[PDB]
Point group: C2
Chain length 141, copies 2
């Protein structure tokens, strides 16, 4: 229903949590190597162009989570099979990658200004659930 | 703004995540003993928690002690359970509301769920199966939704 994409994730437990969140919600998981850890509906990609090559996402429906040049995630309408792109919990998305995203495809979660990053799994769960809400919690209940 | 209550949390990391979720959204955190892990300023700091984040949380001895010390409005105190519950997103939430979660392993003890009126019972939508949504993910989805209903008052 939704595609969650993790770019070079670092902390094993986060992905674990994300993997499980996808099962519970019907979302698909994409990983962009390199990963910070060994990992023994999900697909690992070698780097970003390979992912772009293999999945050919609709650029208008692929959203990046960045605090620069973005709007509020909740101000946008989402559709099934949207792509939601998250960076590593520490760095976030490399600027070079962010540079590949149009303003309107730049999103962020409201937060108290401040402040440390939300755990990645939490960030992904809120994102998927909000999109799911808009999609009427189809298939769920 | 909102109140999160974790009743006998078992797994440390989940509580560290919730401590961060709280800091980040402005929610007040309540823990109900017994816990699964020691709670500690140092421990929390090596887990990557600042001192603004965890300073102003409250630990209670048991459910009675909590009810005593806080006196939550019953009509605005919601338990997460799958038995006798409505869908979470089908309700309206107000500043000051209490959201009550059980341990990752079992969820809320039956006995506790028994003190909750049906209209004060809720669940997250989920593919039937299954397993539990992770504790901290569950809490973050709930706070953010309530906060969404509140206009993300004080945020961005």
């Amino acid at each position: 229903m939704f595609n969650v994409v993790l770019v070079e994730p670092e902390i094993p437990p986060n992905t674990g949590n994300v993997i499980r969140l996808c099962a519970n919600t019907g979302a698909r998981l994409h990983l962009i190597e390199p990963l910070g850890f060994p990992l023994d509906q999900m697909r690992v990609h070698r780097d970003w162009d390979a992912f772009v090559a293999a999945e050919a996402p609709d650029p208008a429906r692929m959203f990046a989570f960045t605090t620069r040049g973005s709007g509020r995630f909740h101000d946008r309408a989402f559709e099934p099979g949207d792509w939601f792109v998250f960076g590593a919990e520490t760095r976030g998305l490399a600027p070079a990658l962010v540079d590949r995203f149009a303003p309107e495809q730049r999103v962020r979660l409201p937060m108290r200004p401040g402040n440390r990053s939300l755990n990645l799994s939490n960030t992904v769960a809120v994102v998927v659930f909000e999109a799911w809400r808009q999609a009427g919690f189809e298939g769920g209940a």
